[PDB]
């Protein structure tokens, strides 16, 4: 199966009120396993999954050092960006970044990522070919020239091709009892009258992992797009996810409606009906 190691970061300036806030997190697939939050007294990179707790003191010291170096650099970048865009000294601004590697089914680098945003807008991204940059505007073009001068794309690619994958492999092994398990959705359909001639069927998918899922309603085998509401997949808070979709139907015609669920944990797509 395919897997990913990803780090995400948010840096928020607080002009006049001290240092920016830095919150960084790391994920393997859809599971968070580390964090760094600068607004602690002595901030440390910390475990947020059980299977990473076994890493020794040198691991946590090195990751705390990397977090602090990144924060120093994010701080510099927030200042630089304020200048690039000729913005006031007074407003708060946000820098976000993400980076990581995908391990393919053949055990090799499938994809690499390195992307940044300023105040919620795409700023600069590493090209899918991992050789060059794509800049969103003239400010990012300045960054691009600097990163080209220091051959940063090649240096980051070396991280992606080596250590990123080495660490991902290690996490996947150490955490294999949870990371490498596809938990299927528990599914059910509820029924709630809307009027004396209509009812709502709500199709539930609960407790599934990973997050990727599809859930649709059909009437007589036909995809339903009217009289319907779907919620986006959302975390349950126990490491699993939830999703539901509801459709309003004519009373007495419930059995014409079918809910269709597909997930890695389901060997076949599920077809479900209300069961009175």
């Amino acid at each position: 199966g395919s897997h990913s190691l990803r780090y995400f970061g948010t840096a928020v300036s607080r002009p006049g009120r001290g240092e920016p806030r830095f919150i960084y997190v790391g994920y393997v697939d859809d599971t968070q396993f580390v964090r760094f939050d600068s607004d602690a007294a002595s901030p440390r990179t910390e475990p947020r999954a059980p299977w990473v707790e076994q890493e020794g003191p040198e691991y946590w010291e090195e990751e705390t050092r990397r977090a602090k170096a990144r924060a120093q650099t994010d701080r510099a970048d927030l200042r630089t960006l304020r200048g690039y865009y000729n913005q006031s000294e007074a407003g708060s601004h946000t820098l976000q970044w993400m980076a990581g590697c995908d391990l393919g089914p053949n055990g090799r680098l499938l994809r690499g990522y390195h992307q940044s945003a300023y105040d919620g807008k795409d700023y600069i991204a590493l090209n899918e070919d991992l050789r060059s940059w794509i800049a969103a505007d003239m400010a990012a073009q300045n960054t691009q020239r600097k990163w080209e001068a220091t051959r940063y794309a090649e240096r980051f690619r070396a991280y992606l091709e080596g250590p990123c994958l080495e660490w991902l492999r290690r996490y996947l092994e150490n955490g294999k009892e949870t990371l490498q398990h596809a938990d299927p959705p528990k599914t059910h359909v509820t029924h709630h009258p809307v009027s004396d001639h209509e009812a709502t069927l709500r199709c539930w998918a609960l407790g599934f992992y990973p997050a990727e899922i599809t859930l649709t309603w059909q009437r007589d085998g036909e995809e339903q797009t009217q009289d319907i509401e779907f919620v986006e997949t959302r975390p349950a808070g126990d490491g699993t996810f939830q999703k539901w979709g509801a459709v309003v139907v004519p009373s007495g015609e419930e059995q014409r409606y079918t809910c269709h669920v597909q997930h890695e944990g389901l060997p076949e797509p599920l077809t479900l009906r209300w069961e009175p």
Binding site: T73, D77, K146, Y152
Partner: peptide
């Protein structure tokens, strides 16, 4: 990165 190494500085934006």
């Amino acid at each position: 990165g190494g500085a934006i």
